[PDB]
Every structure is written in structure tokens, then in C-alpha cells.
Design a protein around this ligand. Structure first.
Ligand SMILES: Nc1ncnc2c1ncn2[C@@H]1O[C@H](COP(=O)(O)OP(=O)(O)O)[C@@H](O)[C@H]1O
Ligand SMILES: Nc1ncnc2c1ncn2[C@@H]1O[C@H](COP(=O)(O)OP(=O)(O)O)[C@@H](O)[C@H]1O
Ligand SMILES: Nc1ncnc2c1ncn2[C@@H]1O[C@H](COP(=O)(O)OP(=O)(O)O)[C@@H](O)[C@H]1O
Ligand SMILES: Nc1ncnc2c1ncn2[C@@H]1O[C@H](COP(=O)(O)OP(=O)(O)O)[C@@H](O)[C@H]1O
Lengths: 458, 455, 455, 458
């Protein structure tokens, strides 16, 4: 009834970067999100605040290893800094949005009527009915709605890192349900702030999202967390404030119990499908809305970007997917842009962190690619030594013959920065020689990459 | 005589990385350095200790900004522990190579194939060799003025086990070169009141782009005086000095301070006997080509002694190139591309740069487009309250090849390596735009900034 | 710059005795030597350690002759204990002088009034001075032949804390100069079979009198080959070598031995930068006059670096003379008389000599009378069974002034000082005849021999 | 009845050097000595054998300080070497004598009839009656014939050092009667060979022959001998072989006793006056035959040389005196030669030895000569250090004004060699400057002299 070029459902990374590119091309674009803010869940309660918290505490700890006396920091001060940062960024995305005159934004939820028609339902409000030529579904994911008694007594990430959260005081000890990336991250950071942590995992292994058990095992050997495997939780009991009981079965079948001050549910997140999506015939699987590499669904004027598709549930990937949807829409659905998920780096933000990119040795084995590995030991890097954080390794994965760098992984200080240099090499197929001949800035940690590449040849 | 395949004079990065590679291939190599340690001056008094001090005090300051006192002596203890550890590490690595012989001593060159090594004990070992690598580095320039004796140098400040273990309240720094700016920046953050006096008309002459230097100065806001040659330093009491200087016009002025630092540039170090054998040597250093070969065809020269790129990581790369060419018995199988080696000035915030910058592009006749990002918007800048700065990408029109980049801001030292790789192997704006940096690392601003040019 | 009155380069006897005297008068003096000890090469590897070995093994042998086994390692322990003690003694003495600053380092000369001292740490201290004393000594000559690397030098043999701690059974010595003859003599007495090969036609060229050298050789009875340049030293096994040499005629010959010593003379050591400032320098060393003043008028040169009299005690005397002249602000108040400095070649028995000898007297046109004594008749020679030798007094006809003397025999090193004093201050035959030496010291032969000329 | 130019009474140093010089001038000379050998008492039983013994034992001890294990030497082997040396020298003086055809030698004693006539009494023989123009009395001295009960049980120097002596076995301990030079020497050497020594001295002080108590005290502080002063011996008792009792009074008057294996009489020697000497009117005092500096007596054709005159009872002085007598006789009694006793060096052959020459500080004080002393400490000399014999000092005595070296003394290693260099300076009056400017052979001990002279100026 009002008319637009594109509707974007969801205003996280998956949505707004695309929307901004379209708007800049003078496309009329309607974006709607219930939060009424940009950044989605990742800004509201994921990466941004979690890293903020991670940095403040890492800075405290490095200083404690250097001045070798203990440093006094209240968790409420850490949570203030997390909020100050979230607040700057909400304002900044609004101020950047306000520059695009042909972009209209609504605080509300989009329901789909048919491939060219939607209805935006606002908070205390009416139906806005809209017509459109293309649609970008960028509705993200949510915390997995588990059916287990006591679920209501568990904290989630939203509670721990949410903007203006009231979780502002540390417990003496905490049980984390789940050994995936969110759980391990939470276990790492809270342990560093003085909390006793226990992880209980249903399955036999941590980090299912990473297919390579040898890499997972190396990280666990460095982390030395208290992890119980093969231990489904069957109930959470609340005794009183700050007193819970988590009940669980074991690999034998015998029930067992652990008492704690605080229970955190770190299950996987699940894709969020907008109302009406099934009804217009959109192919949807377990992992999410099915898309090809151009982000196009089985309905040809409908794209799906970010966690809604499940292809690579990390914020930087969602942004990349968003821009590719925008490009393809501008080219009127001709496939002019594509996303290469292999070459997207991933970081698990434990302390130390694990980063990786490309093809790792186990997938290489299954594809029949013959490889050669090069190895560096992080005890020998300058910054590691300064800060007293000497654990970890870098591993470069080269294909035999071409010696193309086809993959890389790294546990240690600054892996999040190094992984990008290496991801670039991987994405455009540089070889050991090119890596050896490059001369990274001394004394930065990136200097271990050309160094490690010089090794393989020698 | 004792016969060797290669003799490496100097055991800094310009020396030992190549020695190691030649030894790994079982060449018989002889290396000497008077310190009797690996790492050169860079380790003893340059990059490792200065960046260690820099990282420690910036960590103190970051935490200060987000929520504690550290004495300077503790910082300097940390600097010393790291130096010590790395000396031990290079010796451990050296012990792996059976065919590498190391002496504590100076090398004199006798002819293109003969050297003698002089030890302290006064022993002199004669040796014959097929190739030499001159990796003998550089040394502090020695200005002659009354009162120079009262000046501290960066060697006094960062030297291993230095006695400089207490902070003056006010400090005057002679030189606006990169060592001057770095010292001023770090010490200002530890609470020292700093002042720079520079005889020439500008800062950072090693950087041809004045627009970039002006941007850095405007963000750093240092008290600097230009066209002000010092004529005398007078001592009045302990921890009390008068720096006397001349204005542009010719009139005398003076400043009173607690401490004076000389930072006047470095000069290439030429081994005894190098001149006598006819090595072609300019002002800037031993003349070499890109293969690191000198006018004498079995003699190579690497690192600060050649003056092409006086940074440790450039030095390591040249050492490796010398070793590859020697192994190919002189054939030029390896070459160093200087413009694609990143440089970082370690002020706070730092300046990093690589490749071809606008001043140079203009002189070459290359037409360019610049894409830019303001560091106020970076997540890590926000977390730390370090919001000053800017990233600029330099693209070649037509190809949109990335030919240069410069950045002032936090983590410029990490970002510049990603960018340096793109410059080195010729990636274009589309390629950088299509790559997805790890969120929320500061690296995300690169592809973010490449996406904006395309818009 | 730091301002000094004098800079002394080298801390051997040629350096420190003068430094000490200048410091005693409160001059500000700066001294440097890379060993970071006083005593020079003489202490580290020359006279003190060699004479210590000589005295120990001659004491063993005397007792053997009058009535027990000593391992060579014990001798070398004794040599090391004495060296150690004297290093400590010179440091104790140096600590008495508040105005003397000592560095472990090399001095480079920049101009007649400026030096820089380079330390191992790599620190370089610039310094300005009114006077210099170049006291930088001498070094082993470096013959270039295949297998030189297998040769021991007297440095290896007598050096402080040397690893040479076990005696070979047979030894070949290259050089019939005084170090060659001394080494051969001592080691023969420890049971080593010695052989000398000398390229030139005679021994001890530093001594112009062939009659004297022939007398010494005829008493020493060493196996020596003349006109026999070595062309190669080959190693066959541990403790097994082939010395290959050419005859006068041109034909090749070889000798098989367990050990080879090179003793090829010493060469003067010239500080870096001395040439560059225009110091007049010959083959034999830095040219000086008798005041020790060089062609640069505020620069003096003492000891083996000048080459006039390359013996420690001559060096000490020149150091003192430099210091007196400096104190007189350059006026020539003190002079060294070389011919009146005694010399002793420390073979067993030794040869000592002083003043003008017959070869020289003949060339000058001085007519002489020689008085002589046979050492068979000396009491101490008889007690020890060391009866080989002769004392000769050289008298000037008319005056009967004692102008020279030479002696082979026991205690020649003590007797020569009495005689040197008579030569130096011009005593005549009557005066020596009238003096009554302590009986039964070996000195009684002097006045005994002066009484016979008068008869 | 036979006719000669000169008669020489005694064939020691005082006699034969003069005799040889005369004979060489073709003077007919008759020399007679009861020993029938040349060298006198000094060769028979003084310096030559005592130094021989001293050297062998010093060589043993130096080697013991260097190899730092003990060295085995029987005293009989030391006595063999003493005899071998004495034997060479008896033969050598005879072989040198045989070269002078106008010198006639007799084994016998000379009696003087009048200034021009003597009688030689041979061993199993007649009177040879002789006429002569000059006479040289060179009859030396003997061991002082003391009146004390038990004197016959004491050894003397003649017994200890005599040629072919039967004293060839060391006692465990020995009492030495006398703290003069012979006694201290004997105490030094025997102590070094393992013997326990005690010296008992009549007088209040050691070394009366040296007027300077400060010098004597320094030597005693280094020697650390067992000396009893003010203790005249009153009797020597023999219990059995190797068992004696020496009885003595003390400074109070109370008798006391010491038991020993061996008693040595080290009294002063006394001049020996030939028969007839008094009767012709020769002036004779306590110290000996009175002579002027030309060795001439009150009877003008009679000279007296060596210990017979008592002016300087050391062998090298006696030789010097002999030659001066020979010269003056040749010049027919005109005083053409003179002896300067001040400038004759003296050594006391303890271990370490003391040597001295010239004017010492106490005589200087009495003459009113103002002096300055220079001092060197023997711990710092090379040879001292090699041999481990580091005790002692060198002292140079300069007159103020001229800075003439007027005296010197030295306790330590090689003082006997150094004293000659210094005696030469003293005899011809060199000054500090001349000593400083001279450069003694390095590394000999004489190098401490120019060194010490350089000090005084500084
Ligand atoms: N029907 C809908 N209409 C509008 N917004 C939606 C709808 N369903 C979910 N969203 C929003 O989409 C956003 C997705 O953000 P996020 O979970 O960070 O995913 P991504 O990383 O894929 O952007 C959330 O802010 C959520 O409120
Ligand atoms: N003649 C010489 N012989 C041996 N080493 C030398 C000589 N001259 C200088 N050097 C050494 O060479 C090293 C140079 O290293 P450095 O100054 O760090 O430069 P680079 O980074 O180019 O290696 C120093 O450690 C210095 O001591
Ligand atoms: N450039 C220099 N700077 C300082 N000392 C030096 C230099 N060259 C040589 N030397 C030192 O000078 C000393 C010379 O002493 P030595 O060889 O014993 O001769 P001399 O007997 O003449 O003193 C040696 O210890 C040597 O290390
Ligand atoms: N009347 C005499 N006739 C000949 N010889 C004598 C007479 N009296 C003593 N003698 C001898 O004179 C010698 C003196 O020797 P010595 O005591 O060494 O004194 P000096 O050192 O004075 O020569 C002795 O050998 C002794 O036998």
C-alpha cells in the first residue's frame, strides 16, 4: 500500500550493512526490527559487550603479571564499561542511518503475506502494509528454547551481557550447561575474575562447530577447565537466591547432583524464521533458511543473510552476506557477488583465544588433499613474553605441490589479529614463498607468520 | 688458514637469520659480534626494550582510563626480564646448528676472502671464506657541542640493565626524528613533561609525506620547537640543566629542565678494512642492489649498514635474501622489495605505513583514490578510550590496486601487516572489500573502508 | 666532551707506569685496554709467565743435578697463580689514584685532541684531551701458509689459563728468534725433543754480533736448520704432524713431530685512526725521538708500538719519560738512552747484554779491549753444575770506560744490571776493579774480571 | 838466607789475591799457610761451604712451595755437595797458582824475626830462613778460645762446614750459643732442615756488628727464631752421645737449664797474630793489627790485610785489601791505593738474608746527615711470588739536598745480588735520578730498585 524496492527484516549485521548500501544507491528500503536499534543480538548481547568485558579483564590480568601485586576491580565497573561502549555504538549506528534519506526504519516485527507484500506490526500499534520488489530476511537467531524443568532459573548470555543488565555481582561459583563456544568463553572469562566454574555437557566433545578434534583437544589442554562430558542435565532446582541444584545423568545412567550459586545455559542458538515464511513455500532445513552462495532462496526475489541461514553464524560473515545480497539485488538477481565461507576467519574468545580459517587437517584428510604443517611455539614471541601469556601454538596448513596456504589455526595472544592476515592469504591463495618473503612489522606478533613460513622451506 | 663458506660480521637480525639458514643447509659459517650475544643493538637498546616499556605503560594507562601505581623501576625490571629471556632464546636456537661457529669479537677485513677476528683476551683468529655478509649495523650519531656529556641517549634509557631507573619531572629531547617522538610520547604518558627542540624545519624526515607528519603532530600535540639548533647544555645541580639554543633569526634562548636526551639519528657502522678493500660506500651506507650484493661480488651487506630500510624486520628479510643468493653461488635468486616493508613509528598512538604514499605517487605520475576511516568508530578504540586517529588506503586509479596505506591509531602495528600483504602481492579494492575480517578486531575497519570506496 | 689532560691507549707497562705518575700529580687521565687489566701482553702471555715456567723448571733441574717429578700441569698452575696475583696487584695499585679513569675497550683516534672509546656493551665514550700516549704494543706476526692453523704460538703456551697443559714428546719450532730459542731451551729441559727451522741464514737477528750468537748456539747445542722456509704443516692424527720445508737449493724435505710452534716475530700495533691523522709510521713502528714525541707534537708513543727497544723494562722507562715531558708541557726534560738498557735472552743458560758491543764499536771506529772470565770458575755455577758460559767486558781504549758487556751463564740476568749501571753512568776499569762484590755471589766475577785487565 | 821481594803470611783471600798480583809483576813472593791449600778458613769452613749448604736446602724448599708436596733430602747428600764444591775449588786455586813461576808456596807457619826476616816452620820439618823487602800479614782469625766448662763438647762452624767433616746427621734439636751473624745463619738453615733450634745470647741484642737496632729488629720479626737474651752460658754438660745440658744464668741471676741433642758455639772469631809480631813493635789493638786505609802498619814495609786487621771481616773485603797492599808495595810504599770500607756490601745469610751497604740511618743521625728513606715491600716482586718467599723490605737511604744514595739495606730473596748494584751506586755516589732513569732487566728482582727510586721523586 506503500511501495518499496527492498524490505529488510532485522537490523543486525545481516541487515543494516546491506540496507545502507542499497539506500546509498537511492533504493527505497524499509527495515524493521523489534529492538528499534541497529546491531542486533550481537551488539545487544553478543560479541561487542562480551569482548568489552574480556578486554577489561585481560588488561587487569596482564598488569597483574607485570606489577606482580594483585589489581582491585569490581565487576560492576566492568559492566559499566560494557554499557558505555554499547551506548556509544547504538548512537553511532543511528547517526550513520540518518544519512540515508531513502531508508525508513520501524521498531516492529515483519510478517510475510506473499513474496512481494509484508505487514509491519509495531509495539503499541497498527499494521503498516507494504509492497516490495525484493526481500532480505536477516532475522538472525535466538537462544534455544529448551524443555527442561528449571530452565527459568538459568541465566543466558542475554542476561550476562545484555545492555543495562542487572547481573552486576559475581557468584562464588557457576555451572555452565554446554561446552560449545559460548560456554567455554564464559567459563574462561569468569574464571579469570575469581569464579569457580564447572561445565556440564550433554555430548562427548566440546566445540562441535569445529570438526577437528585434535585442535579442540589442544585448546582444552591449555585451558584446563572443569568439564563433565556425557552428562545431560535433567533438572535445575532453586533453593533460594544464589543457591541452586543442577541435577544430571552420567555415561552409566546414575543421577548425580552439583550445588552452585549460579546456572548459565549455553545451548546453541537457533535460527529465527519470520511469520509467513513457511506459508509462501520457502525451503528451510534444521540449520536454517536454505540459500545458495549468492544468498538467494528458492523464491527468487528473496534473499536470506546472517544467522537465519546458518551457513556461518558469526557477525563478520553476516555483514559480508548482507553486502552480497545488496549487490545481487541491484544486479536484479543476476548472480554478481558470492560468499566464500571457507575463507572467513573464526575466533573463539577464550583466554587464550583460538582462531582459525580455511581448510584444516581433518577436512583435508577427507578431501584427499595432501598437506604439510608448519608450527610455531608461542613461548618465543615478544608480546607473549612481555605479558606473561606464553601458552599456545600457530599452525600453517599448506597443500603439497603448490604449497598454497589452504588453512591456518592459532591458540594464543593476538590470534584474532593474526588470523586476518592469514585469512587474506587463504582467500587469495598465497603460497609459503610469498609468506616467507613478506616482512611483518617488528616486534608485533604477526612477525611469527613469515618466520613460520621461512621454517617450512628450511 | 681455517676455511669457511661464509663469514657473517654482526649478530643482529641482519646477521644471524641468514647465518642460521646457511648453517641449516650445512654450510660452514663463522659469525662474530663484540657483545657476544645475538640480537644486535635492536635487542640491547632498540625495539624490544622500547616496545616492552611502551606496552607496559600503555596497559597501565588503559586500565586507568577504564576504572593503581607502578614505579618506573618495575617497568625497567620488566624490560630487563624480557631482554634476558631473548638472549637466552637466541643462544638456545644457535646451539642447534653444528656448522655455525660464533665468537665474541670484532671482525677486520683483510681482503675479499680473508678476515681476522680480534677477541678481548687479545687472541686474533685469522680466517678465509668464500662469502661475507656485512651485517654490522648502525650507531648513535655523535653531535659535538659543549655539554653533550650530560645528555642521555636511547641507549642509556633502554639499554640492558641500565642505571636509568628513576623518572625526571621535566625532560628536553634533542631531535624530532622517530626516536625523539617515541621517547616524548612514552614518557609523557608516564607523567614526564616533555619538550622537543629540533634544528631542522620539520619532524620525521625519513617520511617524505608532510601531510601525514602534520596529521600525526596535530594528534600528538607535543611541545616542539623547530629551526632551533642547540648550542650548549649546562649543568646547574643534580637533576637540573640549561639547554641553550638559537632561534631561526639568530637570537639566544634557553630552557630549564631536569634531564636532556639526545636523539640525533643513527650512522651506519663500517667494519675495519672495508674501505681499504674498495667497497663502494655512500653517506647512507654500503651501496648494494636489491639482491644485497655489494660492488665486490662475493660480499653482501644487510641491515642498517646498507641504510636502505633501517628496521629490524627489513634487516631479517635482507639477511635471508643474502643467504639464498649465496647458496645459489651468487646467482640472483632472491630480491628485497623495500616499499612493501611496513614501518611503524611507536608513538602513542602509533603511525604505521607501507607502500607508495601520495607525495611519491604524485612524483611518479600515478593517479590515486584515497579511502578513509575515522578511528572514533572502531570498537577497540572505544573500549580503551583511545579514539584519536585515521586509516587511509591508497588505490591506483583503473586497476584499483592497493599501492599504499597509512594509519594512525590503536593496533596500527597489527593492521599494517594485513595491508602490507595486500600491497606486496597486489590485491585490489574488490578483493579487500570481499574479505571478512574477524569481528570485533580492529582489522574489520579495512574491508569496511574498502567497501566505502566502491560506494 | 669529557675533558682530560692525557689519554693513554694501552695498559701494558708502556702505558700504566706513566699514567700512574701523571695521576699522582693529579692530572686527569683516561686509560683504556681491551683486556680490562693492567700488564699488557707481557703479563698475559710474555715475560712474567714464561720466566715463571723457566724458574720453576730450572729449580726442578737444579735439585735433580744435586741429589722427584712435577707434572707440567702443576708448573702451569704456578704460572697461572702468579699471573692472577699480579693482575690483582695492578688493580690494587690503580685504585689509589682518584684522577685516573680506566675503561675496558679500544681507543680510536679522531683528531690529535679527540678519541672515542668503544666498549663491548657497544657503548662509545667520546673524549677530548691535551696529550696522548700511544702505548698499544705489538702482536704476533701472521705468516700465511697452509696449516698455520695447527701451530701453537707462545700465546697458546704461556697465555693465562691456557688449555696447553700437557707436553708433547717431540716439538718443531718455526723461528730462531729469541722466542724460538727460549721455548726450545725450556722445553728441552722438561724432556721435550725440540727442533728449530728458520727460513733466514742465522739466529737472533735483533743482535747484530754474530760472534756472540755463535757462542750462544755452540753452548746451547740445539738442533736448528737454517735457510729452510716452511711451505706446509699437515695434520695426520691427534698429536701428529708433518712440517714440510724447502732447502736452500730448492728441494723439498719433511719432518714428523707431535707439535708445532710458530715464533715469527712480533709486529707493532697501530690504533685505529692513527694513520688517518698523519702520524709518521715506519716498518719498525711509530717514529719517535728520544723524548718519545711523535711528529704530532702533543702525541707521544712508548713501548713496542715505537719498536725502538721492545722489552718490558724499556717500555716502563719510555712511559715514565713521556709522563715527565707531558708534565713539562712538551719541553724535553727527559730522554731515553736505549743502548744502556740491558737485554736478556732467557734460554738456559741465558744471554744478557748491554751497551756497545764489538761489532758496533768497530763500525763506529772505537778501539776496544775485552776482558773475559770463564763461568766454570764461579761458585754458584759449581754448586748447580751449570758451568757453561762466559762474561765479557768491553772497555774503551784510553779512558778504559766500560761501554758494553755481555754474559752467558747463570744469573746473567742479575749481573747485567750492575754492569748496565756502570755502562749508563760511565764507570771505568779502575772503578770496577776497586769495587768489592758480595762473596760468594756470582757478581764477584765482575771486579775479579776488571782486575785482570789491569794485569 | 833465601831472598824475596815479599813474604805473604796466610793463603786465604787476604793473601793469595795480592800474592798473585805481585807474582804476575814478576816479584819473587813467598807465601806460607799451615793448611797447605789456598782459600783460608772461608773456603775450608766459612762462606763457600755454608752457602753451598744454604743453596741446596733453599732449592729443596722452593720446590716444596711450588709442587706443594714434601721433598726428601738426606743431610749427608747435602754434605756431599758441599765437599764436591770445596774439592773443585782447592784444585782450581792450585791450578791458578801454578801459573806464577816467581811464587813459592809452603805448607807451614811463619814466625817473624825482624821486619825483613822470617822463618817458615813446616809440618814434619826444618826452619826455612828467609829475607824480604815487604811483608803482608794475612793470617786471618780463629774461633774465639772461650774459658767455660764443657767447651770441648760444643760444635763450631769448623765442624759443621769443614771439608770432609763427619757431622753428617741432623739432631732433633740444637742449642746455639751466640746471636751474632754465624749463629743466626746456623739457626736459619738448620731450622729449615727440620731441626729445633734455640739461641742463647750473653748480651741484650743480636748482631752487634750492625750498629742499627731498628734493622736488626725487623729481621728478627721476620725470622721468628727462639732467642734468649741476657743469658750467659755457665756450663755445658755431656750426658751421653746426642744428649747435653746447657746451663745458663738469667737477667735476674737464677741458674736455668735446657736439654739438647747438640750444642754449637757461635762466638765471635778473633784475629790471629803471628809469632814475633808483638816483638818487633807492631801496633795491635782489640780488633786486630792497626792499619791505615792503605793497609800499612806502623812498621812501614809491613802491611796487614783481611781479618787480621779487623776493619771489615768479610772475604770480599779481604780480597780488596790484598790487592791494595800489592799495589802499594809495587809503588814502593807510596800510598797509590786505598780501601773504602763503608762502600763494601755485607750479607747475613739467614733465610731470608739481610744485605746492607754504606751509611745507615743510625750512623746518619750521629753524623748529622739529614736523610730521606724509600721503601719497597717484597710481596710485590715477581721472583718472590714465584717462589712463595714474600717476606721483607728494600730501603734506600738518600742524603737530603744532593739526593745521593748514601746507603741501602734489604731483607729478602736475592738481596745478595741487589746489594752489589746498590753498593756500586753508593761507592761512586749516584743519586735518586740516576737510579730512577736506569732500567733494570725485567722480570729480575733488581727491577724493584729503579722502581723504588721513581717513588721518592713522586
Ligand atoms: N520478523 C522480524 N522482523 C524484524 N526483525 C526481526 C524479526 N525476527 C527477528 N528479528 C530481529 O533480527 C535481528 C537479528 O540480529 P542477529 O541475531 O544479530 O543476527 P545477524 O547476525 O544475522 O544480524 C534481531 O535484532 C531480531 O530482533
Ligand atoms: N667489526 C665488527 N665485527 C663484528 N661485529 C660488529 C662489528 N661492527 C659492529 N658489529 C656488531 O653488529 C651488530 C649490528 O646489529 P644492529 O646494530 O642491530 O643492526 P642490524 O639490525 O642491521 O642487524 C651489533 O651488535 C654490533 O656490535
Ligand atoms: N686501540 C687500542 N686501545 C686500547 N688498547 C689497545 C689498543 N690496541 C692495543 N691495545 C692494548 O695495548 C696493550 C699493549 O701492551 P704490550 O703489548 O704489553 O706492549 P708494551 O710493553 O709496549 O706496553 C695490550 O694489552 C693491548 O690490548
Ligand atoms: N803464622 C802464620 N803463617 C802462615 N799462615 C797463617 C799463620 N797464621 C794463620 N795463618 C793462616 O792464614 C789463613 C787466614 O785465612 P782466613 O782466616 O780466611 O782470613 P782472610 O779472610 O783474612 O784471608 C788461614 O788459612 C790460616 O791457616
Amino acid at each position: 500500500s506503500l511501495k518499496y524496492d527492498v524490505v529488510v527484516i532485522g537490523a543486525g549485521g545481516a541487515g543494516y550493512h546491506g540496507a545502507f548500501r542499497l539506500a546509498k544507491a537511492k533504493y527505497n528500503v524499509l527495515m524493521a526490527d523489534p529492538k528499534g536499534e541497529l546491531g542486533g543480538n550481537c551488539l545487544y548481547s553478543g560479541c561487542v559487550p562480551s569482548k568489552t568485558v574480556r578486554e577489561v579483564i585481560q588488561t587487569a590480568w596482564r598488569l597483574t603479571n607485570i606489577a606482580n601485586v594483585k589489581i582491585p576491580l569490581d565487576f560492576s565497573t566492568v559492566q559499566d564499561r560494557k554499557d558505555y561502549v554499547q551506548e556509544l555504538r547504538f548512537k553511532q549506528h543511528k547517526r550513520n542511518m540518518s544519512q540515508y534519506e531513502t531508508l525508513t526504519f520501524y521498531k516492529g516485527y515483519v510478517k510475510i503475506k506473499d513474496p512481494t507484500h509484508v505487514i509491519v506490526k509495531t509495539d503499541e500499534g497498527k499494521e503498516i502494509e507494504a509492497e516490495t520488489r525484493y526481500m532480505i530476511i536477516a532475522s538472525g537467531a535466538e537462544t534455544a528454547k529448551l524443555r527442561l524443568p528449571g530452565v527459568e532459573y538459568c541465566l543466558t548470555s542475554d542476561d550476562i551481557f545484555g545492555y543495562k543488565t542487572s547481573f552486576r555481582k559475581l557468584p562464588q561459583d557457576m555451572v555452565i550447561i554446554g561446552a560449545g563456544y559460548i560456554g567455554l568463553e564464559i567459563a574462561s572469562i569468569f574464571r579469570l575474575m575469581g569464579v569457580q566454574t564447572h561445565i556440564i555437557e550433554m555430548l562427548d566433545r566440546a566445540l562441535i562447530t569445529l570438526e577437528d578434534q585434535d585442535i579442540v583437544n589442544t585448546l582444552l589442554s591449555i585451558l584446563k577447565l572443569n568439564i563433565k562430558f556425557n552428562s545431560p542435565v535433567t533438572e535445575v532446582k532453586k533453593i533460594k537466591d544464589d543457591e541452586y541444584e543442577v541435577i544430571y545423568s552420567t555415561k552409566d545412567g546414575s543421577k548425580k547432583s552439583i550445588f552452585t550459586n549460579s546456572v548459565v545455559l549455553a545451548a546453541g542458538r537457533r535460527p529465527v524464521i519470520p511469520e509467513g515464511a513457511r506459508e509462501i513455500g520457502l525451503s528451510i532445513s534444521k540449520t536454517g533458511i536454505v540459500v545458495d552462495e549468492t544468498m538467494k532462496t528458492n523464491i527468487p526475489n528473496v534473499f536470506a543473510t546472517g544467522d537465519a541461514n546458518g551457513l556461518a553464524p558469526y557477525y563478520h560473515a553476516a555483514v559480508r552476506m548482507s553486502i552480497a545480497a545488496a549487490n545481487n539485488i541491484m544486479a536484479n538477481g543476476m548472480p554478481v557477488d558470492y560468499v566464500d565461507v571457507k575463507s572467513i576467519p573464526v575466533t573463539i574468545y577464550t583466554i587464550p583465544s583460538l582462531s582459525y580459517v580455511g581448510i584444516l587437517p581433518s577436512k583435508a584428510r577427507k578431501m584427499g588433499i595432501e598437506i604439510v604443517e608448519a608450527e610455531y611455539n608461542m613461548e618465543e614471541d615478544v608480546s607473549a613474553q612481555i605479558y606473561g601469556q606464553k601458552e599456545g601454538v600457530l599452525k600453517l596448513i599448506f597443500e603439497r605441490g603448490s604449497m598454497r596456504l589452504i588453512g591456518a589455526w592459532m591458540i594464543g595472544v593476538h590470534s584474532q589479529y593474526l588470523i586476518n592476515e592469514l585469512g587474506l592469504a587463504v582467500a587469495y591463495g598465497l603460497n609459503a614463498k610469498q609468506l616467507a618473503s613478506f616482512a611483518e612489522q617488528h616486534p608485533s606478533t604477526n612477525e611469527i607468520i613469515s618466520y613460520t613460513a621461512r621454517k617450512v622451506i628450511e
